[PDB]
């Protein structure tokens, strides 16, 4: 019935007009007067030389000393970043890994990829060896992202256009979120872990409620696939990185876009996005083999992190904000400061 | 300066490094092949002669092959096709009888053109297989090879038609100096397919070792 489609289109026009009426002044006008950040220079303090293939994911531990990296050579390695030592080396059953996570308590890690299975590993056991705790199956497409809520809950993002919330003890999908139209590529939990956002290949991002399992809001504006997403430290905003060489900042309360972070000479897509501790710096990894640092309040590039010989595939910032770790398609991780 | 526990941790790290190096050396001597196809074009039978991703392992003449079939990975192809960059060779299956059935050598031709000229597979050789010799040979005497290729002018014979299709498929590559294409008609079912794959892989390995040395 085309009447339903016409009603949907009318509702879309109504909501677009409603969010246009709320745009009084841009963020640029508000922050036209604050002093610029200046120039940010970071030197690679450490280099990790364990992997033998391309690195696809990494995640910082909550204690800001241990991090886990996943590469397509079939190994999970947990590094002690202060002294470069390797704490654990976990061999994976399937070597096509695309995602990785570290539990907030530090007891578990998660892994997944093209085999449509999320695997949970137990790090602290009496036998002294890392063992596979659970294997979560149920997605039809490849795992894109996974993030721990606690030691018993986890949210996973899959390429079959759906996101799900699991119960690790029982291994069953507690809730399924099904709103997207294309592959879901990214994921980000709120600081208070009551909401989360996902970026999909339909060039849209959605806001979900874990308790009720329904899409609160939908944000549009990108012109291509979305590869990365990350909440603002306040929790009232988030930033997305897409394939059209553009990063954008959205605000939940204003329900619309705020900034566009682009330059004329950048024509490559963004693979990873992250924020600093104070939320003033926005770090984004590109296909030009170097990360860029953006002034989030002024959309002016403040620095470049050029130390990699291949595409930067992952990026993360410690909880206390001391260091930035970037992994690339060459087998080296660089820790900046 | 290091304490006793720090020294023991460093020793553990070194032993982990040794194990990682050993597994890397062991894995570097295995040949990885990616299997592609338009549909039910003969992948099943070639797998027989030897969830998401499917792996197949077999050993021939003291050489270990791993064949990855990603037919069941139903999603956007460009979001994970770069995961297979660096494979030794690509195996392509084309149904030689699928011309009368409904212009189905045009989907195969488009897929071959897309995969051969892809950015990630500029230097990766492609092995081309043409399944279903007998069925196409039987069909060619009833259905002329003019439904798909009208410009073709020649006798309706198995050999000439097969050569015409082979020539049509081969020249679709733009970079003819950075990769080779090996063509075979896999219907003998007399272990000639495995031998041909082994020969092509050995030639590819030799032409790759003639580049690290600088000779090329």
């Amino acid at each position, epitope marked *: 019935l085309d009447q339903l489609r016409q009603e949907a289109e009318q509702l879309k026009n109504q909501i677009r007009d409603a969010r246009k009426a709320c745009a009084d002044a841009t963020l640029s006008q508000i922050t036209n007067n604050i002093d610029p950040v200046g120039r940010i220079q970071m030197r690679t303090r450490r280099t990790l030389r364990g992997h033998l293939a391309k690195i696809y994911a990494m995640h910082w531990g909550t204690d800001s000393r241990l991090l886990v990296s996943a590469s397509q050579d079939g190994k999970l390695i947990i590094w*002690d970043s202060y002294t470069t030592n390797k704490v654990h080396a976990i061999p994976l059953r399937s070597s096509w890994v695309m995602t990785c996570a570290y539990a907030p308590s530090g007891n578990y890690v998660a892994c997944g990829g093209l085999d449509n299975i999320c695997s949970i590993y137990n790090l602290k056991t*009496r*036998e002294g*060896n890392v063992r596979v705790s659970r294997e979560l199956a149920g997605h039809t497409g490849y795992l894109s992202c996974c993030r721990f809520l606690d030691d018993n809950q986890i949210v996973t993002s899959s390429g079959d256009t759906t996101c799900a919330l699991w119960d690790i003890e029982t291994g069953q999908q507690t809730t399924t979120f099904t709103g997207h139209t294309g592959d879901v590529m990214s994921l980000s939990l709120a600081p208070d872990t009551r909401l989360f956002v996902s970026g999909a290949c339909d060039a849209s991002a959605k806001l979900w409620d874990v308790r009720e399992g329904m899409c609160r809001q939908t944000f549009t504006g990108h012109e291509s696939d979305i590869n990365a997403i990350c909440f603002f430290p306040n929790g009232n905003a988030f930033a997305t990185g897409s394939d059209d060489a553009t990063c954008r900042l959205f605000d939940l309360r204003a329900d619309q876009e705020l900034m566009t972070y682009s330059h004329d000479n950048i024509i490559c897509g963004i693979t990873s996005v992250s924020f600093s501790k104070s939320g003033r710096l926005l770090l984004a990894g590109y296909d030009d083999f170097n990360c860029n640092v953006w002034d989030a309040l002024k959309a002016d590039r403040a620095g470049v992190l050029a130390g990699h010989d291949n595409r930067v595939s992952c990026l993360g910032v410690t909880d206390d904000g001391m260091a930035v770790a970037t992994g690339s398609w060459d087998s080296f991780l660089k820790i900046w400061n | 300066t290091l304490s006793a526990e720090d020294k023991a941790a460093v*020793e553990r790290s070194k032993m982990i490094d040794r194990n990682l190096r050993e597994d890397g050396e062991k894995a570097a001597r295995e040949v990885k092949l990616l299997l592609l196809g338009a549909g039910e074009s003969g992948k099943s039978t070639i797998v027989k002669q030897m969830t998401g991703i499917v792996e197949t392992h077999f050993t021939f003449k003291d050489l270990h092959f791993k064949m990855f079939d990603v037919g069941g990975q139903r999603s956007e192809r460009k979001k994970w096709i770069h995961c297979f960059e660096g494979v030794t060779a690509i195996i392509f299956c084309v149904a030689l009888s699928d011309y009368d059935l409904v212009n189905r050598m045009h989907e195969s031709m488009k897929l071959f053109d897309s995969i051969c000229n892809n950015k990630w597979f500029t230097d990766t050789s492609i092995i081309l297989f043409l399944n279903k010799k007998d069925l196409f040979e039987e069909k060619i005497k009833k259905s002329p090879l003019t439904i798909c290729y009208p410009e073709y002018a020649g006798s309706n014979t198995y050999e000439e038609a097969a050569a015409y299709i082979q020539c049509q498929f081969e020249d679709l590559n733009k970079r003819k100096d950075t990769k080779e294409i090996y063509t075979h008609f896999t219907c003998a079912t007399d272990t000639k397919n495995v031998q041909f794959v082994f020969d092509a892989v050995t030639d590819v390995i030799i032409k790759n070792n003639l580049k690290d040395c600088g000779l090329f």
Partner: single-chain antibody, 233 residues
């Protein structure tokens, strides 16, 4: 089921030879460095030998250097100690101890049951002044240990370990690195202190807590134990 069983002890004439075995089961033996700890019939604990994972590093106490030899057989999951030229001062019970070293690990966590052996007839000093103290159930007690050299290291770790030995039993780890509780230890036990001054606090003491408490240092070899503080009543 992480038990370690020792065997090979008995009566031997002085100047003889004897070997001891430690059959491990229930854990990844090849990943753990193993120790040998000795206890005289009515004295405190004393460290003897240590072999690392992969047999890369071996250490001996100055009292047994040149006479004892330690080795391991990873495929057979057994630990050996070859003893030669035995004296009357070697009569004691020998314990088998496991310990794994990485960031955040808990060394000396499991002790074997021990085997008895009788023979016919610069180092950091840890002091435990209070030999014994009467304790009534339901109350709180404090045990003090002291070090002649500062155990605090430049990286922030204070290498002090607390052990409890119940009557007729092998010692059990309580607190490692002066502040962290071992697995399975109730929250009543608490450890605190500064360089060269440490204290163990027990709150709401009850039964099964009577025994002798030892303090050990892991800053540098050879590892040295305290005299031992004993609780009763």
């Amino acid at each position: 089921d992480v038990q370690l069983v020792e065997s090979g002890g008995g009566l031997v004439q002085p100047g003889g030879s004897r070997k001891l075995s430690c059959s491990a089961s229930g854990f990844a033996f090849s990943s753990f460095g193993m120790h040998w700890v000795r206890q005289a019939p009515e004295k405190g604990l004393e460290w003897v030998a240590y072999i690392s994972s992969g047999s890369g590093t071996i250490y001996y106490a100055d009292t047994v250097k040149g006479r004892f030899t330690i080795s391991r057989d990873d495929p057979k999951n057994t630990l050996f100690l070859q003893m030669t030229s035995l004296r009357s001062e070697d009569t004691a019970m020998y314990y088998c101890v496991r310990s794994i070293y990485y960031y955040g690990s808990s060394p000396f966590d499991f002790w074997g049951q021990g085997t008895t052996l009788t023979v016919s007839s610069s180092d950091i000093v840890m002091t435990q002044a209070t030999s014994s103290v009467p304790v009534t159930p339901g109350e709180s007690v404090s045990i003090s240990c002291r070090s002649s050299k500062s155990l605090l290291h430049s990286n922030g770790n204070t290498y002090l370990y607390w052990f409890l030995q119940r009557p007729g039993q092998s010692p059990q780890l309580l607190i490692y690195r002066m502040s962290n509780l071992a697995s399975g230890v109730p929250d009543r036990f608490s450890g605190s202190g500064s360089g060269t001054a440490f204290t163990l606090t027990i709150s709401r003491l009850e039964a099964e807590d009577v025994g002798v408490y030892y303090c050990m240092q892991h800053l540098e070899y050879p590892l040295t134990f305290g005299a031992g503080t004993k609780l009763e009543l």
